[PDB]
Design a protein that fits this description.
heteropentamer; A mainly beta; B mainly alpha; C mainly beta; D alpha/beta; E mainly alpha; A: four-stranded antiparallel β-sheet; 10 strands; 0% helix; globular; D: alpha/beta; Rossmann fold; six-stranded mixed β-sheet; 17% strand; binds palmitic acid; structural protein; adhesion GPCR; GPR133
Chain lengths: 126, 272, 340, 213, 58
């Protein structure tokens, strides 16, 4: 189970950035996925999520309407598009996967202990 | 002879045509009730291996179903005995005991429902001994009191049933009346608590499910006093003869627990 | 930091080297080697005994070495030592903490262990000459809950924890001899080799590790699963082991090949494995499931050759006698049946 | 040698009586799991002569994924809530939608009722920053505002209540319900609220066994 | 981040040690498993039909 993320970097405020995660090892069409982040000197925060077929999507309020999520089952990749970024949206963005297939529950914000999570990518706004 | 002789204290006679229809209703309902209580008993016997079925509320239902089954079989055989002889007397004794056992078990069901719904806590306590005692032994004591004081008041009647011209018929109505009143009170309390947490169809379904087990449909037969209650006798017969059918429908076929247990059992059997 | 990035790249390079070595090792596959063996047919097993007496859900079970006495752990705080032949309870040990998730029967039959959310492994002396059964030792060194405990000998025990660490205790002194660190998630199951020198440990990181008891160090790491590993079980010869997970798959790994061989999964199974066990000859691979069933796989040809049904809730424990005569399954319906 | 066979039966009949005795103690007590957003803690309290048994797993890790399955026969889960609010909402999502906790009810406890009164007045950390929908939330007017608090606080509390109820009454399709409540740092009547909620839970479970409700 | 680099160093040492292990071909491991199963088949009560005379559970 490998989750490699990319697409980060330094972005001017009000800009745009598209993060992508490459998933290898598991049937991508059976697992609900997630996007988490960790601001410097803070804890892990849940940003968005997506269902098996992409029918159900939720956000964390502060990102509602500016961030969108999408998954491509054929290519085993998942995207998170960021629009109109703000300096407050600086963190290392991880692409966590929900623990079990065909499940609506997800305990995947554990304090630097979740096994099915990527190394993460740094997104800075300045 | 019909089913309405069970709880008629006044000596009223109906014109020809009502007797025939009432006897036909008694036969049809009683047969359709015994052939359906057999089903609701074999269902419990088969499904007893399931954990949910192994609680206390199925002891009461099983024993009540057995009591009603034997009582209705005995009444069906009792409709043809040439009254005024030893088989008539023994059948009268057995019918009295089994009908009082049925009413005692209906009271047991009422008390268990009261201890599960109204007095929410303390229901898990094991009261099997008390329930079995007050269901089976108490009818035996009432029969022993009825015997040796009104022994001649069993065979000496128009039909193979304890007489209504000597006052000995209240040995069946009075316990039945007490059971009906207590069950009506419990049912009113349960309807109130189910309507409180329902905020009309939900209450109606609850009353329909509770009608057969609590045995509140027998109040119709005791209301034939004035003499213009032929309709009341009809309702009593046709709604209390189908008690086994109602029990099987509402407590053996529309029950979610029983249906789920049967589904699990049939998926087990399909793998063989 | 530059050092951290370089070190991670180095680790990735060695991971790629290991993958290439394993790929070059796999000249053939077990599926295409075992096509000239007659199928076992249809295996029908019936519930010979149903063992009642538990109030809460049975969470663990272990057979004895004599294939007669088996111990059961329930969430109501009980440890009942049954007699399978006569369906007679022999002991009823009340536990200090009701939440017990494991139980181990000593090979000598003198001690039984238990543990759970209390974070403590407690050994019970069954012999207890001139007295009743009581706590012998209270092993407490784990920060997380105990998922599985197994007896190597009558004196030393091996336990798993929810703090991502396996331990090897010395019951006589009640102290940790070695600590088995190296996992990243909760360790959920152990299996001791027929020779008590090696043991494997499943975890919640979809990885099974091969540990050396004496050296206190890993030998191999097996990663072929997608989700948490719940059950683990050595082959009778000690050269392989099956591994159940929450992705409806129970694979088979080898120690000498150091890679998976055969995956035992079906499209109609969308539940998770909670128990994995092997027959005496290793041909049959019994597996528990969350669909209230238990499938009898064929270890050589990955086909279903039997279904064990009759549990209301999920099976949470499965065991095969050392004699290999009966199989016991415990579920969350407070029942415990024996199939043969 | 039938002496061993009869001694085994005697021991069986001796420990079966003890199991019967312990069955009443197990059934007459009600277990509760207390969690928020030596290694296990047990609190025993009784109200109106019924025994309760409260648990607080506070000596373990944050991966509450394998040991949360142990608490499926528990009658209720006490969820205490003090972006911690979003974490609490997701935790309640996972607890509600877990396929082993589909029949376990949850008794919420929204604390910091007096702490939010000064927080909203200060305005340093507006709730609208984390929840943009709060800018258009109106009180449903079926409320019980305590005289002494501005409408802002009695709207804020009902906002989190409505979020939790939106989570609750939307999915699951299970035999379980949620019971929101508001507490403070000075009241001591929360035990009565837990007692009433548990009474309701077992009441509904019994009614559904009779298939009335 | 000393803990992170220490953990990475431990993982690297583990990978270094694990990559140096002798591996036999799968065509040999499968043959060994098949031979073991064929040799022990005659003593497997679950697989072969167990007679009722020596069966202790019936
Ligand atoms: C302490 C009691 C626990 C439960 C005991 C078993 C209850 C379920 C079985 C009751 C019905 C048994 C079969 C009845 C058949 C009949 O009356 O003809």
């Amino acid at each position: 189970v490998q989750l490699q993320e990319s697409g980060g970097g330094l972005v001017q405020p009000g800009g745009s950035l598209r993060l992508s995660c490459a998933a290898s090892g598991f049937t991508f069409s059976n697992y609900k996925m997630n996007w988490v982040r960790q601001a410097p000197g803070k804890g892990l925060e849940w940003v968005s999520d997506i269902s098996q077929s992409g029918a159900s999507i939720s956000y964390t309020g502060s990102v509602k309407g500016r961030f969108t999520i999408s998954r491509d089952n054929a290519k085993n990749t998942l995207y998170l598009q960021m629009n109109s970024l703000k300096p407050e949206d600086t963190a290392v963005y991880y692409c966590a996967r929900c623990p079990a297939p065909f499940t609506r529950d997800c305990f995947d914000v554990t304090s630097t202990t979740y096994a099915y999570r990527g190394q993460g990518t740094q997104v800075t706004v300045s | 002879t019909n089913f309405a002789i069970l709880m008629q204290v006044v000596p009223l006679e109906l014109a020809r045509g009502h007797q025939v229809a009432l006897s036909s209703i008694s036969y049809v309902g009683c047969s359709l009730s015994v052939l359906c209580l057999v089903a609701t008993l074999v269902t419990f016997a088969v499904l007893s291996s399931v954990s949910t079925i192994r609680n206390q509320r199925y002891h009461i239902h099983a024993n009540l179903s057995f009591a009603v089954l034997v009582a209705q079989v005995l009444l069906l055989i009792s409709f043809r005995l040439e009254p005024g002889t030893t088989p008539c007397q023994v059948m009268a004794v057995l019918l009295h005991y089994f009908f009082l056992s049925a009413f005692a078990w209906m009271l047991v069901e009422g008390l268990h429902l009261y201890s599960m719904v109204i007095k929410v806590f303390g229901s898990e306590d094991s009261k099997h001994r008390y329930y079995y005692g007050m269901g089976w032994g108490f009818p035996l004591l009432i029969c022993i009191i009825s015997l040796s004081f009104a022994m001649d008041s069993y065979g000496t009647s128009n039909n193979c049933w304890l007489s209504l011209a000597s006052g000995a018929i209240w040995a069946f109505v009075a316990p039945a009346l007490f059971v009906i009143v207590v069950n009506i009170g419990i049912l009113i309390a349960v309807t109130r608590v189910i309507s409180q947490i329902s905020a009309f169809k939900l209450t109606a379904k609850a009353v329909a499910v509770l009608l057969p087990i609590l045995g509140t449909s027998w109040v119709f037969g005791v209301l034939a006093v004035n003499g213009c209650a032929v309709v009341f006798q009809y309702m009593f017969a046709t709604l209390n003869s189908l008690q086994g059918l109602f029990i099987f429908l509402f407590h053996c076929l529309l029950n979610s627990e029983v249906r789920a247990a049967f589904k699990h059992k049939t998926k087990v059997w399909s793998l063989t | 930091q530059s050092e951290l990035d370089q070190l991670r790249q180095e680790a990735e390079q060695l991971k790629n080297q290991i993958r290439d070595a394993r790929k070059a090792c796999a000249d053939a596959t077990l599926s295409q080697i075992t096509n000239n063996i007659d199928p076992v047919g249809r295996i029908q097993m019936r519930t010979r005994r149903t063992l009642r007496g538990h109030l809460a859900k049975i969470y663990a079970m272990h057979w004895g070495t004599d294939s007669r006495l088996l111990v059961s752990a329930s969430q109501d705080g009980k440890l009942i030592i049954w007699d399978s032949y006569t369906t007679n309870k022999v002991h009823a040990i009340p536990l200090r903490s009701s939440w017990v998730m494991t139980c181990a029967y000593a090979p000598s039959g003198n001690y039984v262990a238990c543990g759970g959310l209390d974070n403590i492994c407690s050994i019970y002396n069954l012999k207890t000459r001139e007295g009743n059964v009581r706590v012998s030792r209270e092993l407490a060194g784990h920060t997380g809950y105990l998922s599985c405990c197994r007896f190597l000998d009558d004196n030393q025990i091996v336990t798993s924890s929810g703090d991502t660490t396996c331990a090897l205790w010395d019951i006589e002194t009640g102290q940790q001899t070695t600590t088995f660190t190296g996992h990243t998630g909760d360790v959920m199951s152990l299996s001791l080799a027929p020779d008590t020198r090696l043991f494997v440990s499943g975890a919640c990181d979809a990885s099974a590790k091969l540990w050396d008891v004496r050296e206190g160090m890993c030998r191999q790491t097996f990663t072929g699963h997608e989700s948490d590993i719940n059950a683990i079980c050595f082959f009778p010869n000690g050269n392989a082991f099956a591994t159940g997970s929450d992705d409806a798959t129970c694979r088979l790994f080898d120690l000498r090949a150091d890679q998976e061989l055969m995956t035992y999964s079906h499209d109609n199974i969308i539940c998770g494995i909670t128990s994995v066990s092997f027959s005496k000859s290793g041909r049959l691979l019994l597996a528990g499931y969350d669909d209230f069933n238990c499938n009898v796989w064929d270890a050589l040809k990955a086909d279903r050759a039997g279904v064990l049904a009759g549990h209301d809730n999920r099976v949470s424990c499965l065991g095969v006698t050392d004699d290999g005569m009966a199989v016991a399954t415990g579920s969350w319906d407070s029942f415990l049946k024996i199939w043969n | 040698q039938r002496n061993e066979e009869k001694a085994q039966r005697e021991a069986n009949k001796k420990i079966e009586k003890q199991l019967q005795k312990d069955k009443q103690v197990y059934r007459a007590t009600h277990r509760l799991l207390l969690l928020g957003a030596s290694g296990i803690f047990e609190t025993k309290f009784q109200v109106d002569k019924v025994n309760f048994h409260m648990f607080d797993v506070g000596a373990q890790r944050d991966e509450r994924r394998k040991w949360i399955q142990c608490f499926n026969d528990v009658t209720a889960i006490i969820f205490v809530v003090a972006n911690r609010l979003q974490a609490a909402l997701k935790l309640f999502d996972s607890i509600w939608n877990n396929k082993w906790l589909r029949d376990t009810s949850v008794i919420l406890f929204l604390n910091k009722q007096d702490l939010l009164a000064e927080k909203v007045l200060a305005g340093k950390s507006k709730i609208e920053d984390y929840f943009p929908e709060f800018a258009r939330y109106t009180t449903p007017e079926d409320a019980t505002p305590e005289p002494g608090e501005d409408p802002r606080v009695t709207r804020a509390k009902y906002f989190i209540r409505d979020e939790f109820l939106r989570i609750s009454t939307a999915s699951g399709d299970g035999r379980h319900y949620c019971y929101p409540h508001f507490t403070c740092a000075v009241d001591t009547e929360n035990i009565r609220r837990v007692f009433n909620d548990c009474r309701d839970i077992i009441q509904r479970m019994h009614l559904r066994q009779y298939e009335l409700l | 981040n000393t803990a992170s680099i220490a953990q990475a160093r431990k993982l690297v040492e583990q990978l270094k040690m694990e990559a140096n292990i002798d591996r036999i071909k799968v065509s040999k491991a499968a043959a060994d498993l098949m031979a073991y199963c064929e040799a022990h088949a005659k003593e497997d009560p679950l697989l072969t039909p167990v007679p009722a005379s020596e069966n202790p559970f019936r």
